[model samples]
Target: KVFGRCELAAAMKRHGLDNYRGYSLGNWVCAAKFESNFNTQATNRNTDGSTDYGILQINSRWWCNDGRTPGSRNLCNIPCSALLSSDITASVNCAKKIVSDGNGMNAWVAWRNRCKGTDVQAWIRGCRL
Candidate 1:
């Protein structure tokens, strides 16, 4: 089995990112660790989509389409379950396309700027493994 460190690297590759930067999954994961403890299945809910869930702290109804209800479709290919399936790589692939037109890693810099001063840790703690 791969160590958690290796998992992050693999996630980078899967997402097609050359490497993690200010934002990106690496930073997303950092925030996620504190927000959701790396559990991709997490969730929170409200009419405003304030209900966040999944490993990346993705909003349930917003990203999953599965919503707060069970037996719903992940909606997008990058569903949190895919990330939890031990294929972080594949999960990010879906994210890249959905978020960046198949360019997941491309959003690293943007994410940092978008979430600067937040718990993303990209700028706060600097990049992590």
Candidate 2:
């Protein structure tokens, strides 16, 4: 329950995500929409036995700890539940680091399939950046 497109844009911008590391704000906005629909409590179970957690739906395989997964690098160095917070400071930070290392926005399949190369300005349409 963190956003409604316009609100999400504002929040992202306030967190210094309006544009960071050269990635468009709309791309991240779109990725969150597909990954978790702005719901902070989102979690998706993967067939590989890992779980996607929170607004960015960060995968346990590479990001956070869900307790059951082994050999996880836990790059975010956080519990998966941390991403499911009213304040997304940790999630945002982790996502920033994730993008910095991984393929820009390509770390999430949603970004690759839905947001990549598409017209994303609409994602922030009426939001005063």
Candidate 3:
């Protein structure tokens, strides 16, 4: 399912992403907007042969195992397919693992280019918390 802006914001907040790893809910919302436009089934195959899965675009090469990425670390120990679920719990959990792995949201180039060092509150302005 594709989430609306405020819907994504509230969902992320409910998942403990509001201040997870010191990044605000807006930061997550903004990242998701740029990464997948809040589409839960979003996937992108990179030129390097890694595939990004789900809304936050977790990479198959390092995070999840898709049985296609050679040398996949599978750090999240999950099937890449799980990230594509509409529920988003697996995606959010894997995203938390990404942040906790010391990448701090910079794992996503989209976040660095579009969300980093910016006033992201506009991403959640009408969410009403």
Candidate 4:
């Protein structure tokens, strides 16, 4: 696992995710919770045969290689396995680039369905910052 809500919030502050790529920290935190429960090692296979990777649950279709597959867009150009590490720097950096491509947190379906219009501040409650 990478972070609980509080630690993830603190990490986001350090990584400057609040205003980065036009997304809010609340959105990021909420998305991460719903996407992978903030688990860095999380992975899931989709019905379309693609897989989601790490805390952001980034898809193998465009962002990272699913190990057994080739011809991935690999937009982030990092191995999918790399995103599963305890160190979230790679995951966070890749996410920054992903949002910069004009999608913001919209790149994540979880963000749209789970975070939108929700009281996202609850994700970071009791955090020390």
- The predictions' CA RMSDs to the true structure, in order, are 6.4, 1.1, 0.9, 1.6
| Model 2: ten consecutive residues of lowest lDDT | 16-25
TM-score of 2: 0.95
Please write out the lDDT profile of model 4 over residues 1-129, one tens digit for every residue.
768788888887787787676666878889889999989899998877778889888888888877654555788889889889888777888898888877667789889888988888777778787
Give the winner by TM-score: 2 or 4. Answer: 2
* Candidate with best lDDT: 3
Error of 2 at 1 (Å): 2.2
Q: Candidate 2: lDDT over CA atoms? A: 0.87
Model with the higher TM-score, candidate 1 or 3: 3
Clashing pairs in 4: none
Residue pairs in steric clash, candidate 2? none
Which one wins by lDDT: 1 or 3? 3
Cα deviation at 54, candidate 1, in Å, is 2.3
The candidate, 2 or 4, that scores higher on lDDT is 2
Best by TM-score: 3
Candidate 3 residue-wise lDDT, 8-121, digit = tens = 888888788888999999999999999999999999999989999999999998999999988878988999999999887898989998998877989889999999999998
Give the runs in model 2 whose Cα sits over 4 Å from its true position: none
Which parts of model 1 are misplaced by more than 4 Å?
Answer: 1-6, 18-26, 47-51, 67-83, 97-129
